[PDB]
């Protein structure tokens, strides 16, 4: 809930509902320039694995750009796309897919 941005099929933009959530992250990172965030991006299963890396990367990147828009240091933000290799849940309909189309902000 506080560290995940969700996306519709073939969409990669940060939509308004996540703005607030992301700002807390920017606030935090601006304050602790010691800190590094890893944006893990994902795609649902439709597609093929090496191509769907890119759908994950567009999502993670978009989080990165937004945070940089909030004053965060480029060097506090790395991105790792898992494509469709690490689903949050199994299943073959939109309930499963919307759950898996996401970018997760994690502090490693």
């Amino acid at each position: 809930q506080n560290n995940i941005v969700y996306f519709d099929l073939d969409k990669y933009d940060i939509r308004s509902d996540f703005a607030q959530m992301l700002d807390a992250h920017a606030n935090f990172l601006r304050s602790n320039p010691s800190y590094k965030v890893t944006v893990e991006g994902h795609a649902d299963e439709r597609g093929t694995p090496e191509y769907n890396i890119s759908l994950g990367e567009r999502r993670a990147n978009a989080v990165k750009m937004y945070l940089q828009g909030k004053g965060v240091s480029a060097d506090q933000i790395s991105i790792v796309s898992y494509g469709k290799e690490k689903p949050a849940v199994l299943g073959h309909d939109e309930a499963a897919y919307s759950k898996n189309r996401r970018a997760v902000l994690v502090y490693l």
Partner: protein, 409 residues
């Protein structure tokens, strides 16, 4: 522990007699070579070996074949053979292929192999290959192996890259990981697999020597390093990196380790596959919008679109003779394996399973290994390149995906 199960290619194909091989010892042979040869030929989708219950005779030599007994059954060739022990503990495995149609009693091919016990299946497969090529004119691939990734539910190392023979026997674990493994690729000599691992925290692309487990680091630049493919002349590895901000194609000279960039677009360019000349690649690009397959010479020039089937195409594997590719073709919310004749542009859909991906061709171009989803997990599927033969390799211990067919071994 994978085994092949055929779904269709059942009770059809060219009729052939395969006789249990004679055994020069007490008890049963250490291995049922005629059983192997029968199974292989049936697995090819081209033959219907007569079942054991119906054999009209069980000759243990060529001279003992009675051709008329097989022509009466519309069977025009018969495999017989012998397994004998040697004093050093090894075995001789010999077959003779006997014409039982228009040249009755003529020995069309024969051979003998000296192997130790642990290589009896190997010898059986060599006998299948020779019989197969003699009768159909197509080089046999029964000695080949497949690589694939097994993912169990839980445990500290849920992801395993493994290799087995093409029919499931002699499985071994290549590498275990806490994090996903992707896209194994065989070197043309069969000695190494390239793959992608996320066990460090991000993707790394490596090449593992199978005989000793040695690992060569190829690429771990920021972002993604994956989608490897070895050039058929042994000189290069193509792959994809997204450090520039989108996936692009690179090639590494394996001798020097020198990496060269091949595509530099703002689109994503990935899943490279080699044409027979080790100079051209087919690959997936999204530059036109939805993914399609393109073709580029690694030495210079603009990639050219080659697919127009349905709405979307990607993830291609070009045949060892360059005449066709198979690929994953998407339409109406479904995706299946398709074959495209590279000279005419014609397309035939091969598969009807669900969520088909990652097709790999056998090195004779007659068979495709790929993965689909059955219930909540991935499984492996086989379909011939004429779309008539279909089988599976059901597994016991988890989902199975990312198949890759070895070169000839």
């Amino acid at each position: 522990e994978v085994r092949i199960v055929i779904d269709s290619g059942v009770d059809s194909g060219r009729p052939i007699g395969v006789v249990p091989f004679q055994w020069a010892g007490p008890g049963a042979a250490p291995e049922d070579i005629g059983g192997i040869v029968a199974a292989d030929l049936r697995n090819s989708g081209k033959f219907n070996p007569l079942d054991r219950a119906r054999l009209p005779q069980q000759p243990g030599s060529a001279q003992e074949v009675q051709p008329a007994a097989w022509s009466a059954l519309g069977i025009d060739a018969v495999v017989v053979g012998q397994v004998t022990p040697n004093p050093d503990g090894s075995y001789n495995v010999a077959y003779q292929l006997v014409d039982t149609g228009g040249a009755p009693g003529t020995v069309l091919a024969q051979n003998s192999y000296k192997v130790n016990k642990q290589w009896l299946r190997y010898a059986g497969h060599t006998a299948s290959d020779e019989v197969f090529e003699k009768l159909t004119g197509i080089k046999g691939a029964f000695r080949t192996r497949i690589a694939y990734v097994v993912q169990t539910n839980g445990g500290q190392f849920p992801y395993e890259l493994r290799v087995s023979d093409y029919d499931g026997y002699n499985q071994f674990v290549v590498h275990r990981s806490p994090q996903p493994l992707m896209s194994p690729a065989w070197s043309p000599d069969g000695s190494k697999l390239a793959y992608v691992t996320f066990e460090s925290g991000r993707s790394a692309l490596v090449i593992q020597t199978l005989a000793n487990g040695a690992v060569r680091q190829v690429a771990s630049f920021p972002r993604h390093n994956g989608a490897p493919a070895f050039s058929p002349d042994g000189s290069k590895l193509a792959f994809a990196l997204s450090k520039t901000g989108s996936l692009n194609l690179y090639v590494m000279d394996l001798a020097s380790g020198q990496i060269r960039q091949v595509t530099d677009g703002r689109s994503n360019n990935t899943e490279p596959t080699w044409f027979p000349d080790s100079q051209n690649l087919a690959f997936t690009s999204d530059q036109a919008g939805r993914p399609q397959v393109y073709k580029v010479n690694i030495n210079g020039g603009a990639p050219q679109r080659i697919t127009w089937e349905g709405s979307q195409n990607q993830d291609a594997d070009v045949s060892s003779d360059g005449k066709f590719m198979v690929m994953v073709s998407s339409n109406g919310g479904q995706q299946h394996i398709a074959k495209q004749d590279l000279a005419t542009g014609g397309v035939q859909v091969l598969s009807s399973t669900f969520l088909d991906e990652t097709p790999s061709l056998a090195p004779n171009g007659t068979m495709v290994l790929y993965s689909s989803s059955q219930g909540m997990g991935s499984v492996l599927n086989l379909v011939s390149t004429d779309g008539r033969f279909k089988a599976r390799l059901p597994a016991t211990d988890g989902q199975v995906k990312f198949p890759a067919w070895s070169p000839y071994l």
